Design a protein around this nucleic acid. Structure first.
Lengths: 54, 101, 89, 61
RNA sequence: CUUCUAGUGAGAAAACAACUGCCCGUACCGUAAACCGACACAGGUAGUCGAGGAGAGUAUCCUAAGGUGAGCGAGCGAAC
RNA sequence: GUAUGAGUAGCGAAAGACAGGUGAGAAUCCUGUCCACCGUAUGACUAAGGUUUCCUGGGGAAGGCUCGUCCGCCCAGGGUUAGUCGGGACCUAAGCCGAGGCCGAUAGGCGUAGGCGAUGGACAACAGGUUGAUAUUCCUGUACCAGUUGUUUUUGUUUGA
RNA sequence: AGCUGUAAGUAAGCUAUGAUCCAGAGAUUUCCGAAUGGGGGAACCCAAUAUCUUUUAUAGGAUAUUACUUUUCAGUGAAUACAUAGCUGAUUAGAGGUAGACGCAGAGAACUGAAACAUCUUAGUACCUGCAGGAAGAGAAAGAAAAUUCGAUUCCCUGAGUAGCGGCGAGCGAAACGGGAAGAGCCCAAACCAACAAGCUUGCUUGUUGGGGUUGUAGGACUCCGAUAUGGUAGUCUGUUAGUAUAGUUGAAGGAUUUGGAAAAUUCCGCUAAAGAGGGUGAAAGCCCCGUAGACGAAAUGCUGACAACACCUAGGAGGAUCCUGAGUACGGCGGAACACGAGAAAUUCCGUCGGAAUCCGCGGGGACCAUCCCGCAAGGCUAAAUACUCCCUAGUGACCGAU
């Protein structure tokens, strides 16, 4: 998904070397989860990372 | 400009030295002014409404202000006109012994 | 502005004919419905009904000095009367 | 000129407005049928209507 | 468009008479010298009508209504 | 910019002749006569497409594969009329745009409701005359569609109006 | 004192009652275009509702309002009671352009060199996209150092083609010290103290206001005394003044002779200069014309100063019993990027995933790691100047071009 509603994790990109550093491109998406949570008392549905779930 | 429409004038240069006259028309915006009997030119007029015939006419042609003095009339000579603060206008004031035009 | 609809009258060999059946020709400024011209004439000349007609025109060219330019648009107005005349031209 | 306009009330203003309108219509027609020795009045009328209108503007706010 | 109900919700039908009806397109060429091909080009262009004699027929030969005589010629009458 | 090739190749299918005009000038323009060519088309009407080439009066510098008094060329003036015909103030097909919305590093992608979209549906005028050019538009005669006013004929908005 | 553009011409006029013209303030500004009532092939078509108009009325005409989203507020509301979607109305702000320049990021190539080519380089460049400002970015030490210390940041000279990195190949390439330009430092969270509200546990917990407090020589709270001053500004669109930018005014001195069509040329004899820079006039002018050196000048509008007034901010000394000093943060493993540093013995800085600290007897750093020593206090914000650029205006200059 796009972002986290609470913090600002977002997708990005970096290379990927393999045993002879042939450089290509990759994607690093942040772990994300859809959960129903309270906002103003109105339960929403939104993306929250699995690192702000403690 | 220092030259108006009706203002007698001496001519300094150009085949009409010392000959005077009366300014007829004033063309600023190109600095040309025409006088009487100084710049006669012959025009091969074609048969027209005016002058049904086609005579060779004789009119005057413009001269550049650098060929024109001004006149004293109080005295009768040429003055490198200067300007004075006479009462609340700027009436031209002659040089060469203080005249007032 | 209900006086600057009509601009001026057309005077042509054709128009002069229609003067012999109470039919007149003016240049009407663009963007004007029929009914507007009805009102304008009735209110400017003490005349009446017999529905108007109307037209449109294209422009043209001209060549002076390597200068190619169009001309204005038009809108004729051919008006018909019932009972009165226009001794105005 | 300009000053005589300032003397009259709004009624006379609109009056003279309509009068100049009619005069302009007549000048227009008499143009197309070979007349009007003095065509330099077609300026004067439009400019006078302009003056009347602006002077009206400044009074009404 | 025709019906039926729910339905806001004076008294509308039809006499006849007399009036009102907005903007945009309308010239011209259009199996062509005016379109598509650089051209006043032996090419291409969808639809309707498309006559007479014989004749199965819009085939073929000559013709009606109708249109055209084509944008370099005058001579001679060899090779090719 | 100018030579050589060189006054060479070419002048882009199809039948013309004479008389008289016109004019500085004529095979090439106008008029007349005979001839000849196409005729399910080289004839009549329309949709595109072109954009004033249409008509009237002048001109001959350039274009016209030659000539040219002539022209689709140059100059000047002037022509295109609608309740009924084709389209808009009606309906929708393929397709497209798509409030919210569902996805996506940004850009954005896709789609509901609603719309836009003739090649289709549905709908009130016919004949003749008139000009140098327009004609179901102008004119004559006979009609049709939907409304508005004026004297001209049935009352509980319940609804037997 | 002439005037109605380029541009001849004719007709019509205007102007000493001060035109035309110049400069500063205003007024009007059709239609498309983010386009915004709806629709669209841009410069077109068709609407709704209220007000007012024309005709007896129907049609016809003009005026004003009516998009989307969010930020605040009411009302209405309901699968489901209470209220939450939703709807309606009002209210706040956005939405496009570019100066083909300069800045900060997200994303990110190939030819080319290595005389081939895979790690490397060309290069974080070209191009795309987002976000701005007249500048941006950085900025008040968990720093630099290593005796003897210095105390925000940026930019320039030198360090230096050095120490380093690198199929140790082609190549990449610093930083501190030193010399200079400009200078500048502030505000919070928390612990505590009060008022209001809620659970009134009526324990005192929650919250909101307002007060108090901002640090390494550890500071603050907290207790106890003094004072209630003394110094400041990076605020106003508030006045008062001075200057300046946008129209201007004034401004010195020559005649004759020979050649010419024409003199500024030539030959005589004069004059002026705080003015001998330049341009023009029938050929080449200190003294003909426009000017230059000087001297003066603003009803209106704008900027920059200054000092007024208002706003805001800031106090000592002594004590150390208890309290506060930024949490899924620092940091570890794993996989990638950033630092001259290509994992290398790899400190320092980020990103994704998992694991997960202490609380002043405490914590971070000094290029793996440990010990002694030394220097600092992260996980909250703001901050002028010295620097880069020029679509545009004003005035200038050039051993720069002179119609291929």
């Amino acid at each position: 998904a796009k972002v986290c509603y609470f913090t600002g994790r977002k997708t990005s990109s970096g290379n990927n070397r393999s045993h002879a550093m042939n450089s290509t491109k990759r994607t690093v998406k942040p772990n994300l989860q859809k959960v129903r949570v309270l906002i103003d008392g109105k339960p929403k549905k939104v993306w929250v990372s699995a690192r702000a779930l403690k | 400009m220092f030259v108006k429409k009706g203002d007698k004038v001496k001519v300094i240069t150009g085949k009409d030295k010392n000959k005077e006259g009366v300014v007829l028309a004033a063309f600023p915006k190109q600095d040309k002014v025409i006088v009487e009997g100084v710049n006669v030119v012959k025009k091969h007029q074609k048969p027209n409404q005016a002058a049904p015939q086609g005579g060779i006419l004789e009119v005057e042609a413009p001269i550049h202000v650098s060929n024109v003095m001004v006149i004293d009339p109080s005295n009768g000579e040429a003055t490198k006109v200067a300007f004075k603060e006479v009462d609340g206008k700027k009436v031209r004031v002659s040089k060469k012994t203080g005249e007032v035009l | 502005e209900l006086l600057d609809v009509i601009k001026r009258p057309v005077i042509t060999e054709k128009s002069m004919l229609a003067m012999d059946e109470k039919k007149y020709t003016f240049e009407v400024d663009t963007r004007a419905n029929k009914t507007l011209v009805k009102q304008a004439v009735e209110s400017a000349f003490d005349v009446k009904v017999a529905n108007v007609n109307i037209l449109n025109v294209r422009p043209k060219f001209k060549r002076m000095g390597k200068y190619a330019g169009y001309t204005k648009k038009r809108r004729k107005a051919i008006v018909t009367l019932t009972e009165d005349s226009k001794e105005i031209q | 000129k300009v000053k005589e306009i300032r003397e009259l009330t709004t009624a006379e203003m609109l009056d003279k407005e309509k009068q100049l309108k009619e005069e302009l219509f007549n000048l227009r027609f008499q143009l197309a049928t070979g007349q009007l020795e003095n065509t330099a009045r077609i300026k004067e009328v439009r400019q006078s209507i302009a003056r009347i209108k602006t002077v009206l503007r400044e009074q009404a706010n």
